[PDB]
Amino acid sequence: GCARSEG
Amino acid sequence: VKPNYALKFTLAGHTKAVSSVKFSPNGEWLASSSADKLIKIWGAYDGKFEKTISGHKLGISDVAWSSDSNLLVSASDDKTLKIWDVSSGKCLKTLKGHSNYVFCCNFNPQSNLIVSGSFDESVRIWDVKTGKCLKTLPAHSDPVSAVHFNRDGSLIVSSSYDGLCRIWDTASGQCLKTLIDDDNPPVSFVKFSPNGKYILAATLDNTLKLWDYSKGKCLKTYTGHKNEKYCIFANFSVTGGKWIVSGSEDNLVYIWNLQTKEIVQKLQGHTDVVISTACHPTENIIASAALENDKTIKLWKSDC
């Protein structure tokens, strides 16, 4: 859902 | 001496991974951002849900408070930042200029400026009042993971998957320093210390380091946690003992003695990577937030 949680 | 953090509250409500948590400078509130495109506001002492703030078109990777606890800024995959008035929930300004996901953000201490970092490999500096971009810094050669102003706002520190931490003169946009150690792993987080003397940097080789910015040298390293993949926040805890706090990819919160580098506590409870932690500005309280398999925020309190 977002770049940070995708890693 | 060691702290005694204990789980006080678990905060449910985000419908996807939580991406960041931050305590308001006045100590009243916790703000959280999430892949679910939402910002949620919670009571800092009781964990009680306050309100949801919405408007972003895609997930949010970061959120940050203004110095007076009145404003928030959020950074989103929709390639914008938004400035919010917390009390009214209104989106005051949408900051457009980055050409790729906005990953990280912060107000300067004066909160007249916002700094942002993006997958477009740049750092942008924005005027809060007008929403206008003042400078674009060609900062890095890979996505920018973190951006932070020092105590008087004269400097910006940035970090990047390119393995560098850079320090920028806010007024001139000039690169004043590039910091890197003996290896080149992606730098996943950075921030100035409270007194502005140091820079705490996380790298994707399971390492936190405290840098003397002026001397340009690594002073302390903190290890023992797992961090090879996600851009995990780290904090200076200053209300009781002087600790370093960080989430970990083993689902734990790690607390180190800043001076001795010893692990002094590990907090268990989350069921996914702890992506983000925050330290309350006056009470010994830690907020932790976890990724998609967990979706919760936890509040821990210590008699330090």
Tab-separated table of C-alpha atoms in Angstrom:
chain	number	residue	atom	x	y	z
A	1	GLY	CA	0.000	0.000	0.000
A	2	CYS	CA	2.960	2.332	0.512
A	3	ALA	CA	6.673	2.399	-0.263
A	4	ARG	CA	7.770	2.096	3.369
A	5	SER	CA	5.638	-0.968	4.193
A	6	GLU	CA	6.785	-2.592	0.946
A	7	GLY	CA	10.451	-2.271	1.865
B	1	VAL	CA	20.226	1.038	35.234
B	2	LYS	CA	17.555	-0.273	32.853
B	3	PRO	CA	14.035	0.836	31.874
B	4	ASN	CA	10.870	-1.137	32.603
B	5	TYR	CA	8.605	-0.660	29.610
B	6	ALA	CA	5.356	-2.569	29.850
B	7	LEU	CA	2.485	-2.806	27.395
B	8	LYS	CA	-0.322	-0.413	28.368
B	9	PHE	CA	-2.417	-0.099	25.206
B	10	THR	CA	-2.845	-1.630	21.770
B	11	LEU	CA	-4.367	0.680	19.150
B	12	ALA	CA	-6.451	-0.928	16.390
B	13	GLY	CA	-8.006	0.852	13.427
B	14	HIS	CA	-5.685	1.065	10.439
B	15	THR	CA	-6.711	-1.439	7.743
B	16	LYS	CA	-3.252	-1.981	6.266
B	17	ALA	CA	0.353	-1.769	7.469
B	18	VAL	CA	1.071	1.195	9.737
B	19	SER	CA	4.016	3.208	8.401
B	20	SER	CA	4.983	5.727	11.096
B	21	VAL	CA	3.994	7.008	14.533
B	22	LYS	CA	4.891	10.388	16.055
B	23	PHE	CA	4.023	12.070	19.349
B	24	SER	CA	2.889	15.711	19.193
B	25	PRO	CA	5.495	18.026	20.760
B	26	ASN	CA	2.890	19.070	23.372
B	27	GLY	CA	2.568	15.446	24.512
B	28	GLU	CA	-1.189	15.284	24.028
B	29	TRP	CA	-1.376	13.179	20.873
B	30	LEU	CA	-0.017	10.331	18.777
B	31	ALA	CA	-0.306	10.572	14.995
B	32	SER	CA	-0.038	7.474	12.795
B	33	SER	CA	0.185	7.109	9.032
B	34	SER	CA	-0.586	3.976	7.048
B	35	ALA	CA	-0.552	2.175	3.726
B	36	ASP	CA	-4.354	2.487	4.052
B	37	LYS	CA	-4.037	6.158	2.863
B	38	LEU	CA	-5.126	7.498	6.257
B	39	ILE	CA	-3.785	9.463	9.181
B	40	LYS	CA	-5.176	8.597	12.607
B	41	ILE	CA	-4.916	10.681	15.781
B	42	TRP	CA	-4.871	8.981	19.199
B	43	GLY	CA	-4.660	10.113	22.812
B	44	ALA	CA	-1.017	9.894	23.893
B	45	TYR	CA	-1.713	8.818	27.486
B	46	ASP	CA	-4.808	6.633	27.149
B	47	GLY	CA	-4.467	5.409	23.557
B	48	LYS	CA	-8.046	6.422	22.887
B	49	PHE	CA	-8.817	6.972	19.203
B	50	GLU	CA	-9.502	10.624	18.388
B	51	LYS	CA	-10.082	11.106	14.643
B	52	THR	CA	-9.128	10.035	11.115
B	53	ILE	CA	-7.632	12.518	8.668
B	54	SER	CA	-8.046	11.607	4.990
B	55	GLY	CA	-7.347	12.895	1.492
B	56	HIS	CA	-4.301	11.121	0.067
B	57	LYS	CA	-4.930	9.014	-3.056
B	58	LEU	CA	-2.432	6.273	-2.200
B	59	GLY	CA	-0.648	4.968	0.875
B	60	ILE	CA	1.294	7.238	3.221
B	61	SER	CA	4.902	6.427	4.236
B	62	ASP	CA	5.458	9.168	6.831
B	63	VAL	CA	3.854	11.905	8.910
B	64	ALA	CA	5.352	14.666	11.071
B	65	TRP	CA	4.156	17.315	13.546
B	66	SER	CA	4.826	21.048	13.484
B	67	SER	CA	6.542	22.512	16.576
B	68	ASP	CA	3.298	23.878	18.045
B	69	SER	CA	1.394	20.578	17.588
B	70	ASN	CA	-1.148	22.307	15.310
B	71	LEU	CA	-0.062	20.928	11.920
B	72	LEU	CA	0.897	17.602	10.362
B	73	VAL	CA	2.727	16.880	7.163
B	74	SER	CA	2.328	13.535	5.358
B	75	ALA	CA	4.363	11.937	2.538
B	76	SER	CA	2.545	9.606	0.142
B	77	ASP	CA	2.976	7.261	-2.842
B	78	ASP	CA	0.583	9.656	-4.662
B	79	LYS	CA	3.750	11.790	-5.064
B	80	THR	CA	2.431	14.638	-2.901
B	81	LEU	CA	2.878	15.939	0.582
B	82	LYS	CA	-0.146	17.360	2.379
B	83	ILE	CA	-0.138	19.906	5.188
B	84	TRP	CA	-3.001	19.368	7.613
B	85	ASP	CA	-4.609	21.463	10.297
B	86	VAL	CA	-5.083	18.834	13.004
B	87	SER	CA	-7.908	20.545	14.903
B	88	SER	CA	-10.143	21.048	11.839
B	89	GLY	CA	-8.845	18.053	9.847
B	90	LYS	CA	-8.560	20.342	6.823
B	91	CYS	CA	-5.909	19.773	4.169
B	92	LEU	CA	-4.300	23.212	4.046
B	93	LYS	CA	-1.913	22.631	1.147
B	94	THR	CA	-1.009	19.825	-1.236
B	95	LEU	CA	2.700	19.964	-2.073
B	96	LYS	CA	3.311	18.890	-5.669
B	97	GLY	CA	6.717	18.674	-7.317
B	98	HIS	CA	8.258	15.279	-6.659
B	99	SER	CA	8.234	12.977	-9.685
B	100	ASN	CA	8.017	9.809	-7.642
B	101	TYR	CA	6.734	8.541	-4.275
B	102	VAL	CA	7.359	10.885	-1.344
B	103	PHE	CA	8.937	8.759	1.359
B	104	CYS	CA	9.840	10.959	4.297
B	105	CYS	CA	9.115	14.406	5.716
B	106	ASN	CA	9.645	16.867	8.564
B	107	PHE	CA	9.003	20.475	9.603
B	108	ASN	CA	11.957	22.641	10.585
B	109	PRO	CA	11.945	23.704	14.265
B	110	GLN	CA	10.386	27.030	13.224
B	111	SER	CA	7.802	25.047	11.252
B	112	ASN	CA	7.915	27.641	8.480
B	113	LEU	CA	9.595	25.044	6.265
B	114	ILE	CA	9.025	21.408	5.308
B	115	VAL	CA	11.697	19.048	4.032
B	116	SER	CA	10.802	16.003	1.956
B	117	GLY	CA	12.590	13.086	0.388
B	118	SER	CA	11.435	10.933	-2.469
B	119	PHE	CA	11.976	7.944	-4.736
B	120	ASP	CA	12.873	10.536	-7.375
B	121	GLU	CA	16.250	10.747	-5.573
B	122	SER	CA	15.782	14.403	-4.548
B	123	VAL	CA	15.276	16.411	-1.362
B	124	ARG	CA	12.792	19.298	-1.614
B	125	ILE	CA	12.367	22.255	0.727
B	126	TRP	CA	8.901	23.806	0.890
B	127	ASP	CA	7.414	26.982	2.328
B	128	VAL	CA	4.649	25.986	4.780
B	129	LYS	CA	2.577	29.163	4.332
B	130	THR	CA	2.385	29.211	0.531
B	131	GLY	CA	2.877	25.519	-0.211
B	132	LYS	CA	5.554	26.568	-2.717
B	133	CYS	CA	8.707	24.511	-3.310
B	134	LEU	CA	11.710	26.710	-2.536
B	135	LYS	CA	14.566	24.380	-3.494
B	136	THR	CA	15.136	21.016	-5.131
B	137	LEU	CA	18.365	19.326	-4.057
B	138	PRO	CA	19.797	16.661	-6.399
B	139	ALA	CA	20.727	14.885	-3.210
B	140	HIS	CA	21.234	11.225	-4.012
B	141	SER	CA	21.394	8.557	-6.725
B	142	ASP	CA	18.752	6.306	-5.139
B	143	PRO	CA	15.511	6.810	-3.189
B	144	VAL	CA	15.767	9.166	-0.199
B	145	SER	CA	14.861	7.314	2.999
B	146	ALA	CA	14.892	10.098	5.603
B	147	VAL	CA	15.249	13.878	5.939
B	148	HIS	CA	15.616	15.913	9.146
B	149	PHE	CA	16.438	19.469	10.247
B	150	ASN	CA	18.948	20.164	13.001
B	151	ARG	CA	18.097	22.210	16.094
B	152	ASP	CA	18.106	25.684	14.555
B	153	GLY	CA	17.063	24.499	11.111
B	154	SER	CA	20.249	25.673	9.397
B	155	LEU	CA	21.108	22.098	8.339
B	156	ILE	CA	19.242	19.213	6.721
B	157	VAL	CA	20.419	15.613	6.999
B	158	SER	CA	19.304	13.138	4.325
B	159	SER	CA	19.830	9.409	3.861
B	160	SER	CA	19.517	7.139	0.867
B	161	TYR	CA	19.558	3.625	-0.521
B	162	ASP	CA	22.717	4.872	-2.318
B	163	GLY	CA	24.523	4.249	0.999
B	164	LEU	CA	25.116	7.922	1.859
B	165	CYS	CA	24.099	10.373	4.566
B	166	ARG	CA	24.441	13.954	3.387
B	167	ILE	CA	24.249	17.241	5.262
B	168	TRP	CA	22.876	20.252	3.418
B	169	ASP	CA	22.916	23.980	4.133
B	170	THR	CA	19.216	24.894	4.262
B	171	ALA	CA	19.666	28.425	2.931
B	172	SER	CA	22.119	27.686	0.106
B	173	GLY	CA	21.264	24.097	-0.836
B	174	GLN	CA	24.972	23.262	-0.736
B	175	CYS	CA	26.188	19.780	0.226
B	176	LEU	CA	28.331	20.364	3.311
B	177	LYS	CA	29.254	16.775	4.140
B	178	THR	CA	28.912	13.195	2.941
B	179	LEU	CA	29.087	10.492	5.618
B	180	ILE	CA	29.712	6.779	4.984
B	181	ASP	CA	31.597	4.062	6.904
B	182	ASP	CA	33.766	1.097	5.822
B	183	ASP	CA	30.886	-0.644	3.965
B	184	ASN	CA	28.139	0.739	1.652
B	185	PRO	CA	24.791	-0.741	2.699
B	186	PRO	CA	21.648	1.328	1.972
B	187	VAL	CA	21.059	3.962	4.669
B	188	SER	CA	17.489	3.481	5.776
B	189	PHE	CA	17.045	6.248	8.353
B	190	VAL	CA	18.772	9.301	9.752
B	191	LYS	CA	18.141	12.072	12.303
B	192	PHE	CA	20.018	14.708	14.322
B	193	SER	CA	20.361	14.221	18.088
B	194	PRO	CA	18.474	16.544	20.518
B	195	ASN	CA	21.523	18.802	21.068
B	196	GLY	CA	22.284	18.772	17.340
B	197	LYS	CA	25.796	17.403	17.830
B	198	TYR	CA	25.193	13.895	16.517
B	199	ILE	CA	23.500	12.036	13.714
B	200	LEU	CA	21.823	8.689	14.354
B	201	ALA	CA	21.833	6.582	11.183
B	202	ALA	CA	20.363	3.149	10.437
B	203	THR	CA	21.765	0.939	7.689
B	204	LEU	CA	20.335	-2.227	6.140
B	205	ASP	CA	23.110	-4.364	7.591
B	206	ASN	CA	21.438	-4.666	11.008
B	207	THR	CA	23.227	-1.622	12.382
B	208	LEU	CA	22.542	1.717	14.037
B	209	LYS	CA	25.387	4.245	14.341
B	210	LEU	CA	25.839	7.496	16.238
B	211	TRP	CA	27.930	9.950	14.206
B	212	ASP	CA	29.746	13.040	15.375
B	213	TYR	CA	28.626	15.336	12.598
B	214	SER	CA	31.381	17.953	13.012
B	215	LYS	CA	34.234	15.412	13.198
B	216	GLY	CA	32.551	13.311	10.508
B	217	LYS	CA	33.191	10.056	12.354
B	218	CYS	CA	31.238	7.125	13.757
B	219	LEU	CA	31.336	7.179	17.568
B	220	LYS	CA	29.009	4.369	18.590
B	221	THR	CA	27.346	1.401	16.934
B	222	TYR	CA	24.230	-0.346	18.211
B	223	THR	CA	23.630	-3.930	17.147
B	224	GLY	CA	21.576	-6.954	18.158
B	225	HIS	CA	18.403	-6.261	16.170
B	226	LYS	CA	17.350	-7.311	12.680
B	227	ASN	CA	17.179	-4.683	9.942
B	228	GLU	CA	17.978	-5.741	6.372
B	229	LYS	CA	14.882	-4.746	4.425
B	230	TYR	CA	12.625	-1.994	5.793
B	231	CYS	CA	13.194	1.666	6.553
B	232	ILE	CA	12.766	1.458	10.309
B	233	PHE	CA	12.743	4.647	12.415
B	234	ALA	CA	15.028	5.095	15.417
B	235	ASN	CA	14.734	7.459	18.388
B	236	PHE	CA	16.653	9.155	21.161
B	237	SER	CA	14.795	8.519	24.440
B	238	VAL	CA	15.502	11.397	26.842
B	239	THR	CA	12.750	11.447	29.490
B	240	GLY	CA	14.395	8.966	31.855
B	241	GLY	CA	17.513	6.997	31.063
B	242	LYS	CA	19.281	8.030	27.864
B	243	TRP	CA	18.399	5.262	25.401
B	244	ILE	CA	18.358	4.488	21.691
B	245	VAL	CA	15.052	2.955	20.553
B	246	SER	CA	14.291	1.072	17.341
B	247	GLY	CA	11.928	-1.432	15.809
B	248	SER	CA	13.223	-4.631	14.299
B	249	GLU	CA	12.392	-7.218	11.647
B	250	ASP	CA	12.062	-9.888	14.355
B	251	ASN	CA	8.843	-8.115	15.498
B	252	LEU	CA	10.474	-6.581	18.592
B	253	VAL	CA	11.260	-3.124	19.925
B	254	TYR	CA	14.912	-2.776	20.959
B	255	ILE	CA	16.194	-0.383	23.604
B	256	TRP	CA	19.941	0.285	24.020
B	257	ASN	CA	21.905	2.318	26.529
B	258	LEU	CA	23.127	5.208	24.343
B	259	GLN	CA	26.492	5.500	26.068
B	260	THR	CA	27.336	1.828	26.684
B	261	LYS	CA	25.613	0.400	23.587
B	262	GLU	CA	24.243	-2.486	25.680
B	263	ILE	CA	20.759	-3.743	24.950
B	264	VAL	CA	18.728	-2.937	28.070
B	265	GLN	CA	15.254	-4.097	27.046
B	266	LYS	CA	13.314	-5.782	24.257
B	267	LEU	CA	9.566	-5.328	23.918
B	268	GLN	CA	7.517	-8.292	22.672
B	269	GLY	CA	3.940	-8.322	21.398
B	270	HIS	CA	3.805	-7.313	17.738
B	271	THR	CA	3.204	-10.005	15.124
B	272	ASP	CA	5.005	-8.308	12.229
B	273	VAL	CA	7.997	-6.034	11.614
B	274	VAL	CA	8.060	-3.040	13.932
B	275	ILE	CA	8.486	-0.328	11.309
B	276	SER	CA	8.294	2.700	13.577
B	277	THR	CA	8.734	3.832	17.159
B	278	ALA	CA	8.326	7.213	18.874
B	279	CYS	CA	9.290	8.508	22.320
B	280	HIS	CA	6.877	10.737	24.276
B	281	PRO	CA	8.407	14.162	24.935
B	282	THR	CA	7.846	14.273	28.720
B	283	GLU	CA	6.685	10.849	29.920
B	284	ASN	CA	8.544	7.551	29.658
B	285	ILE	CA	6.224	6.295	26.942
B	286	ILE	CA	7.080	4.506	23.696
B	287	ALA	CA	4.727	4.057	20.756
B	288	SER	CA	5.473	1.213	18.343
B	289	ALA	CA	3.795	0.360	15.059
B	290	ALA	CA	3.890	-2.779	12.924
B	291	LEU	CA	3.413	-3.844	9.296
B	292	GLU	CA	0.622	-5.673	7.402
B	293	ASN	CA	0.250	-8.932	9.354
B	294	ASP	CA	-0.173	-6.914	12.571
B	295	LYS	CA	-1.736	-3.518	11.741
B	296	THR	CA	-1.603	-2.274	15.342
B	297	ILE	CA	0.088	0.426	17.383
B	298	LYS	CA	1.200	-0.304	20.948
B	299	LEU	CA	1.855	2.064	23.835
B	300	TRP	CA	4.447	1.027	26.399
B	301	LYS	CA	5.115	2.858	29.677
B	302	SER	CA	8.081	2.650	32.047
B	303	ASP	CA	9.075	3.599	35.553
B	304	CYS	CA	12.555	4.040	34.090
